[PDB]
Amino acid sequence: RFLKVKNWETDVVLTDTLHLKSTLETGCTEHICMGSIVLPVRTKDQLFPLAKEFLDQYYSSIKRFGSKAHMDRLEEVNKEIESTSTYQLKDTELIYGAKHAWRNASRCVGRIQWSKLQVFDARDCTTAHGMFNYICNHVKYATNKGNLRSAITIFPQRTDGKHDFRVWNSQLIRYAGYKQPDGSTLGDPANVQFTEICIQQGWKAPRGRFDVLPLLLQANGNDPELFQIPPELVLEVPIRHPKFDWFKDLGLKWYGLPAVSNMLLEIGGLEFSACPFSGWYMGTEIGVRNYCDNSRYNILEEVAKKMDLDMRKTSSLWKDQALVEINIAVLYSFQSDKVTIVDHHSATESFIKHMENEYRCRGGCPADWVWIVPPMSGSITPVFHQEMLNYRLTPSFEYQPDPWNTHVWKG
Amino acid sequence: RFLKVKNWETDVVLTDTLHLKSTLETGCTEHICMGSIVLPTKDQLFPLAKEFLDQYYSSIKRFGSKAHMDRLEEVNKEIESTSTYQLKDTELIYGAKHAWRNASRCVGRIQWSKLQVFDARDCTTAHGMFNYICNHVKYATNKGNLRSAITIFPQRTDGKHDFRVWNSQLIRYAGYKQPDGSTLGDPANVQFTEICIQQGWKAPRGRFDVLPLLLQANGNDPELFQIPPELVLEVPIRHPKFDWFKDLGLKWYGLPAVSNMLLEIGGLEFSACPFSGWYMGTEIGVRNYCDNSRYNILEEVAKKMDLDMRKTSSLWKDQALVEINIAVLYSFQSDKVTIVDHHSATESFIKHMENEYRCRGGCPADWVWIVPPMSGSITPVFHQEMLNYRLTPSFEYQPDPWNTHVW
Ligand code: HEM
Numbered sequence: 087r088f089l090k091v092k093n094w095e096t097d098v099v100l101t102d103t104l105h106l107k108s109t110l111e112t113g114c115t116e117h118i119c120m121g122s123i124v125l126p127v128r129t130k131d132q133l134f135p136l137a138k139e140f141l142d143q144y145y146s147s148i149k150r151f152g153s154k155a156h157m158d159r160l161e162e163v164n165k166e167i168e169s170t171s172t173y174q175l176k177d178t179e180l181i182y183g184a185k186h187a188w189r190n191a192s193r194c195v196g197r198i199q200w201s202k203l204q205v206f207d208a209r210d211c212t213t214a215h216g217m218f219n220y221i222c223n224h225v226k227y228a229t230n231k232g233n234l235r236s237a238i239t240i241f242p243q244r245t246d247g248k249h250d251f252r253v254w255n256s257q258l259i260r261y262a263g264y265k266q267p268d269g270s271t272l273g274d275p276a277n278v279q280f281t282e283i284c285i286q287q288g289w290k291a292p293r294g295r296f297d298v299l300p301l302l303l304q305a306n307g308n309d310p311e312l313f314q315i316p317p318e319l320v321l322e323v324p325i326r327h328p329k330f331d332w333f334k335d336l337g338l339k340w341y342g343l344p345a346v347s348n349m350l351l352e353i354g355g356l357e358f359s360a361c362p363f364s365g366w367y368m369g370t371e372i373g374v375r376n377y378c379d380n381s382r383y384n385i386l387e388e389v390a391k392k393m394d395l396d397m398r399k400t401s402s403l404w405k406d407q408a409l410v411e412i413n414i415a416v417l418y419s420f421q422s423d424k425v426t427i428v429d430h431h432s433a434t435e436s437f438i439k440h441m442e443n444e445y446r447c448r449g450g451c452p453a454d455w456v457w458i459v460p461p462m463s464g465s466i467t468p469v470f471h472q473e474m475l476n477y478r479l480t481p482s483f484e485y486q487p488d489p490w491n492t493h494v495w496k497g
Numbered sequence: 498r499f500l501k502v503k504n505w506e507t508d509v510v511l512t513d514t515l516h517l518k519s520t521l522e523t524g525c526t527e528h529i530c531m532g533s534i535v536l537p538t539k540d541q542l543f544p545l546a547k548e549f550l551d552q553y554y555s556s557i558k559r560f561g562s563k564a565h566m567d568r569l570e571e572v573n574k575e576i577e578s579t580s581t582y583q584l585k586d587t588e589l590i591y592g593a594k595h596a597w598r599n600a601s602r603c604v605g606r607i608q609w610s611k612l613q614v615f616d617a618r619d620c621t622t623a624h625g626m627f628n629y630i631c632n633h634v635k636y637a638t639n640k641g642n643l644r645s646a647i648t649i650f651p652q653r654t655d656g657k658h659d660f661r662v663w664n665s666q667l668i669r670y671a672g673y674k675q676p677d678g679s680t681l682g683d684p685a686n687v688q689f690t691e692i693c694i695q696q697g698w699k700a701p702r703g704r705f706d707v708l709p710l711l712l713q714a715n716g717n718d719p720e721l722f723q724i725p726p727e728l729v730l731e732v733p734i735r736h737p738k739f740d741w742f743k744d745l746g747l748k749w750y751g752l753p754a755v756s757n758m759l760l761e762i763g764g765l766e767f768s769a770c771p772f773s774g775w776y777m778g779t780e781i782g783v784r785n786y787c788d789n790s791r792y793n794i795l796e797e798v799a800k801k802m803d804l805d806m807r808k809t810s811s812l813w814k815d816q817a818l819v820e821i822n823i824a825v826l827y828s829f830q831s832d833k834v835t836i837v838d839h840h841s842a843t844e845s846f847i848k849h850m851e852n853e854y855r856c857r858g859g860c861p862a863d864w865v866w867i868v869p870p871m872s873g874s875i876t877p878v879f880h881q882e883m884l885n886y887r888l889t890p891s892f893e894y895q896p897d898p899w900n901t902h903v904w
C-alpha cells in the first residue's frame with residue numbers, strides 16, 4: 087500500500103511506504119482520531135522476534151543482511167535470551183539504536199540532526215553517584231561552552247523491572263517551582279510537585295525564581311539520591327531585548343541545555359528507563375511556552391504593560407504583540423551570548439527538507455503535525471501547509487509513568 | 498468506550514460518550530493517524546432516514562411516540578414507493594442546524610442554534626437560484642450586523658439533475674495569470690476565474706474583482722450572474738498607527754459564505770447549500786493575506802515597516818503578521834462590520850465544548866483546524882485535547898463541478 091501526502095503551498099506530493107513497517111498502535115481507530123491527545127518486563131516469548139526485527143534492520147543498514155556475521159548474531163542473541171532471558175547489545179547496535187529512536191521521533195522537528203548524536207554508554211553504571219558522574223560529563227560535553235552538541239547517556243536496561251535505573255527529573259536542568267500559602271507560585275509552576283519531592287528528600291531550596299533543581303537519581307531500583315549539578319556547568323543566558331532596555335529589568339534568564347530525562351528508550355525489545363538526551367533549543371520552546379503559557383511563567387501581561395499596549399480589548403492583539411517581542415528577546419540574547427539556538431522559521435524549513443529527503447531515501451518520515459507546528463505564527467512556517475502521516479517505528483522514545491507514582495520505597 | 502479529554506492548562510477532564518454514535522469513517526487506522534490530511538439504494542436510504550428521525554424525535558421529547566412511529570412509516574412507504582423522500586420543514590431546519598453543530602472543523606459552533614434557514618427547495622432554474630442567493634447575501638450582511646444563514650436548494654435525485662454553485666464562496670476575488678509569470682489577484686481562484694471567461698465573464702482584470710456567480714440548476718449547464726454591487730459589503734484595510742498602510746490598496750469582503758459543500762440529512766443529499774456566518778480575524782489577515790500562495794503580502798508590509806529582513810531570527814515576518822492582523826480587525830470594527838478575533842473566538846469555543854460535553858456527552862472537534870494559524874499556544878484551544886469523529890447530519894466536501902459536468 088502507498089499513501090500520499092500533499093503540501094498545499096507547493097502542490098508537492100509524497101508517497102509513504104515506510105508506514106508498512108509500522109507495528110505499534112496509534113490510539114486512533116477508523117471511527118476516531120486521537121491525534122491531539124498528549125498521552126494515548128517482557129517474556130522470552132515476545133523478546134526474540136523483537137530482537138530479530140531490530141537486528142535485521144541493523145544488518146540491512148550496514149549492508150550485511152543475510153551475512154554470516156548477521157546469522158551468527160541472531161543465533162548469539164537467540165541463545166543468550168533462552169539462557170539469561172534477555173540480551174546485551176554491542177556498542178554499534180546501541181549507537182545505531184539510539185540514533186534511530188531519534189530518527190523515528192515523530193513529534194521532533196529537529197530530526198535533520200539525527201545522524202549526529204554523541205552516544206555515551208553508561209551501561210556499566212551501578213550507583214546513583216555513578217549516575218551523577220555520567221550526567222555531569224554529559225552536561226559538560228553537550229554544553230561545550232555554548233556551541234551545543236547533541237548527546238545521550240544510556241544507563242542499564244530494565245531486567246525484572248524491580249531494578250530500574252531512573253532519572254526522577256524530567257529534564258536534567260529545570261527551575262524549581264514553589265507554591266506559596268497565598269496560592270501564588272514562585273518559580274516555574276510546572277515543577278512544584280517534583281520540587282516538593284526534592285525538598286522532602288533533603289534539598290535546601292534557596293526559594294528564588296530561578297533555582298536550578300538538584301538531580302534526583304535512582305540506580306538499580308534503589309531509592310533516589312540528591313546531587314547538585316556543579317554550578318559552573320549550568321550555562322545560563324540572561325534575557326534582554328535588542329531595542330527595549332527595560333526588558334533586562336524583567337529579571338529573566340534561561341538555561342541553555344534542553345535535556346529530556348524522563349523518557350524510556352526501546353531498542354530491539356530492550357527497555358532503557360534512564361536515557362537522558364539533549365540537543366539545543368528552538369526559540370519558541372522558551373519564549374512562547376516556558377514564558378507565556380498561563381500555567382508557566384505567564385509574563386505576557388507584565389511585558390504588555392511596559393510596552394504600553396492597549397490591553398482593554400483582546401482585539402488589539404496586545405497578547406500577540408508582546409509574544410513576538412519576548413521571542414525576539416530570547417533569540418537575541420542567545421545569539422549575543424553565542425549559545426546555540428534556532429528560530430522556528432529556520433527549524434521548520436530545515437525539517438521540511440529533512441522530511442522530503444526521508445521519503446526519497448527511506449520511503450517516509452513519521453511526523454506528528456500537532457507537535458511539529460510551532461506554538462506561534464503557525465501558518466507562516468512551511469510545516470503548517472504540509473500534510474503528514476503519524477505512525478510508530480522502533481527504536482523509539484516512549485513516555486513512562488513518573489517514578490514517584492510507582493516506586494516501591496525501601497527506606 | 499468512554500474517552501476522556503484533558504485541558505493541560507486547567508487540568509479539567511471531560512468524558513466523551515457521543516463518539517459511540519459516530520457512524521462515518523475518519524481516515525485513520527490503529528497503525529496510522531491521518532489527522533493532518535486535508536481531504537482524507539432504497540436499502541441504504543431507509544436506515545439513514547430512520548437514524549435521523551429517531552434523533553429528531555428524541556430531540557423533541559417524543560421518541561417512540563405515535564407521531565414518531567407514524568412519520569417513520571410515512572417516510573418508509575414513500576422511500577419504497579418514490580425511491581426517496583422529502584423532509585418536513587421542521588426536519589430541514591433541525592437537520593441544517595445540526596450539520597453545523599457537527600462541523601468538527603468550525604471554531605464558531607457555539608452559535609450553532611442561531612441559524613436562519615432558507616428553504617429554497619421550490620427552486621427550478623439558475624435565475625431562481627440567483628434570486629435566492631441575493632436575498633441570502635442581503636439578509637446575512639444586514640448592513641454590517643451579520644447574521645448566520647444557509648439557503649438549501651433541491652436535494653439530489655439521480656446525480657443527473659444536481660443543483661450546484663460553482664464558486665467556493667458566494668463572494669470571492671478573481672485570479673489572473675499574467676505574462677510576467679506572476680499572478681494578479683487571488684491565485685486560489687485562477688482556474689475558476691478562467692472557467693468564468695470560458696463562459697463569458699468580462700474580467701476587469703483587477704486585483705480585487707468580485708467574481709460572478711456561476712449557477713447550475715437541475716443538472717443543466719452553469720449560468721453566470723453578477724451579484725448586485727450594492728449587496729457586496731467590503732472593508733478597505735487601514736492600520737490604526739501606520740497611515741502608509743492604506744497604500745497597499747487592501748480590501749476584503751465582509752461575508753464569508755461557503756458554497757461548495759454538500760449537506761447531508763437523513764440520507765438525503767443537498768449539493769447546493771451555501772451557508773455563511775462571519776469572519777474570525779486570522780482567516781483574512783493570516784491565510785488570505787500572508788499564505789505564500791495567496792495574496793502573499795508579508796515581504797511588502799515588511800519593507801514598509803523597515804524591518805531587518807536580512808535574517809529570519811529578527812522575527813520580521815512575525816512582526817509584520819501581527820500588524821497585518823491588527824489592521825484587519827481594526828478596519829472591520831471601524832466600519833461596524835461584524836468580526837471576531839481569534840482570542841475571543843477560541844475562548845467561546847472552549848465554553849461551547851464544555852456545554853456540549855455536559856449537555857450532549859461530547860463535541861467532535863478537529864484540533865489541526867480549530868487552533869488559529871497564529872499565536873496558537875496563547876489561545877486556550879491549543880491546550881485542549883479534542884476527539885475527532887463524524888456525525889450526521891453533516892457538511893461534506895464534494896468534487897468541483899467542472900471536473901464532473903457532462904455539458
Ligand atoms: C538538535 C536540537 C534539537 C531541536 C531544535 C529539537 C526540537 C524539538 C522540539 C521543538 C520539540 C518539541 C518540544 C516540546 O514541545 O516539548 C522536540 C521534541 C522531541 N525531540 Fe527534539 N530536537 C532536537 C534534538 C533532539 C534529540 C537529540 C532527541 C533525541 C535523541 C530529540 C527527541 C525528541 C523527542 C523524543 C521529542 C518529543 C518529546 C515528547 O514526546 O514530549 N530531540 N524536539
Ligand code: HEM
Pocket residue numbers: 597600602603604605606608612645646647772773774775776777780837842866892
Ligand atoms: C458565525 C461565525 C462563525 C465563525 C467565527 C466560524 C469560523 C470558522 C473557521 C475559522 C473555520 C476554518 C475556515 C478555514 O480555515 O477554511 C470554519 C470552518 C467551517 N465552518 Fe464555521 N464559522 C462560523 C459560522 C459557520 C456557519 C454558519 C456554518 C455552517 C452553517 C459553519 C460551518 C463550517 C464548516 C463546515 C467549516 C469547515 C469547512 C471546511 O472543511 O473547509 N461555520 N468556521
Ligand SMILES: C[C@H](O)[C@H](O)[C@H]1CNc2nc(N)[nH]c(=O)c2N1
Pocket residue numbers: 122123124456457458459505879880881882883
Ligand atoms: C492538548 C494538545 O495536544 C497539547 O497542548 C499539545 C499540542 N501541541 C504541542 N506541541 C509541542 N511542540 N509541544 C507540546 O507540549 C504540545 N502540546
Ligand SMILES: C[C@H](O)[C@H](O)[C@H]1CNc2nc(N)[nH]c(=O)c2N1
Pocket residue numbers: 094470471472473474533534535865866867
Ligand atoms: C496540511 C494541513 O492539514 C493544512 O495546512 C491545514 C492545517 N490547519 C488548517 N486550519 C484551518 N482552520 N484551515 C485550513 O485551511 C487549515 N489547513
Ligand SMILES: NCCN[C@@H]1CNC[C@@H]1Cc1cccc(N)n1
Pocket residue numbers: 196344345346363364365366367368371
Ligand atoms: N512536554 C515535553 C517536554 N519537552 C521539553 C520542552 N522544551 C525542551 C524539551 C523538548 C526538547 C528535547 C530536545 C531538544 C529540544 N530543543 N527540545
Ligand SMILES: NCCN[C@@H]1CNC[C@@H]1Cc1cccc(N)n1
Pocket residue numbers: 753754755773774775776777780
Ligand atoms: N478552504 C475551505 C473554505 N474555508 C473558507 C476560509 N474562510 C472562509 C471559509 C470558512 C468559513 C465559513 C464560515 C465562517 C467563517 N468565518 N469561515
Ligand SMILES: [Zn+2]
Pocket residue numbers: 114118119120121525529530531532
Ligand atoms: Zn488520527
